[PDB]
Design a protein around this ligand. Structure first.
Ligand SMILES: *[C@@H]1O[C@H](CO)[C@@H](O)[C@H](O)[C@H]1NC(C)=O
Lengths: 41, 27
């Protein structure tokens, strides 16, 4: 939450960097891919 | 903006910092 995540890996490890990283208003999410479609919530 | 003239007038009157400190967050 509320963290620009070019610098998360500063503090079981795949979820710290690498793979695909996404930027949302609340923060950013690691471990999910951002599709271009729209669905029910 | 996708608002209406009345909605636009309303949103321009609500107008009256506090970014983050001492564990104060706004979701
Ligand atoms: C996040 O950081 C990168 C590089 O550190 C910068 O290019 C980007 O504009 C920043 N984004 C925000 C929302 O601060």
């Amino acid at each position: 939450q509320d963290v620009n995540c070019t610098e998360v890996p500063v503090a079981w490890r795949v979820y710290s960097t690498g793979s695909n990283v996404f930027q949302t208003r609340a923060g950013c999410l690691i471990g999910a891919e951002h599709v271009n479609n729209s669905y029910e919530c | 903006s996708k608002r209406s003239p009345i909605e636009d007038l309303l949103f321009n009157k609500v107008t009256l910092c506090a970014q983050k400190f001492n564990g104060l967050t706004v979701l």
